[PDB]
UniProtKB/Swiss-Prot annotation:
Tissue distribution of the protein: Highly expressed in brain, retina, heart and kidney. Detected at lower levels in lung, muscle and nerve.
First-to-last residue of the parent protein present: 3 to 109 of 221
Function: Involved in retrograde transport of recycling endosomes.
Compartments, record wording: Recycling endosome membrane
Residues in coiled coil: none
Name used for this protein in its record: Pleckstrin homology domain-containing family B member 2
Natural source organism: Mus musculus (Mouse)
Binding-site list for a 1,2-diacyl-sn-glycero-3-phospho-L-serine: 25
UniProt domain comment: The PH domain specifically binds phosphatidylserine, which is enriched in recycling endosome membranes, it doesn't recognize PIPs.
Domain PH, first and last residues per copy: 8-114
Top-level taxon in the UniProt lineage: Eukaryota
Length: 120
């Protein structure tokens, strides 16, 4: 039998610029131990927004002005911005509550990038 429950590296709330809403919407992100990243619609975790990998789907990580030619939401800086450059090209624009939150995530990702070859 499988474990049953899985613990996420870091779980928190983050905004995401949708292609249909063309705006920043508060979402729920959650990174897995295997690197895999999955976000939901709300704390309910019932409407699985989507699922994407980091060291597999994401190739580069930009933050702030470095990110695409996007723009931060109202009453929010730019350094708190977090983007994820996918392989093909897909680009996801995210935003943290404050630089602190952003930094944490960014670093967390840059770390999950070292996931693949057996470690032991």
């Amino acid at each position: 039998g499988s474990s049953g429950s899985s613990g996420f590296v870091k779980s928190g709330w983050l905004l995401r610029q949708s292609t249909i809403l063309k705006r920043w919407k508060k979402n729920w992100f959650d990174l897995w131990s295997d690197g895999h990243l999955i976000y939901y619609d709300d704390q309910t975790r019932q409407s699985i927004e989507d699922k994407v990998h980091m060291p597999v789907d994401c190739i580069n990580i930009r933050t702030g002005h470095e990110c695409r030619d996007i723009q931060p939401p109202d009453g929010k800086p730019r350094d708190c911005l977090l983007q994820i450059v996918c392989r093909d090209g897909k680009t996801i624009s995210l935003c943290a509550e404050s630089t602190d939150d952003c930094l944490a995530w960014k670093f967390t990702l840059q770390d999950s990038r070292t996931s693949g070859p057996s470690s032991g």
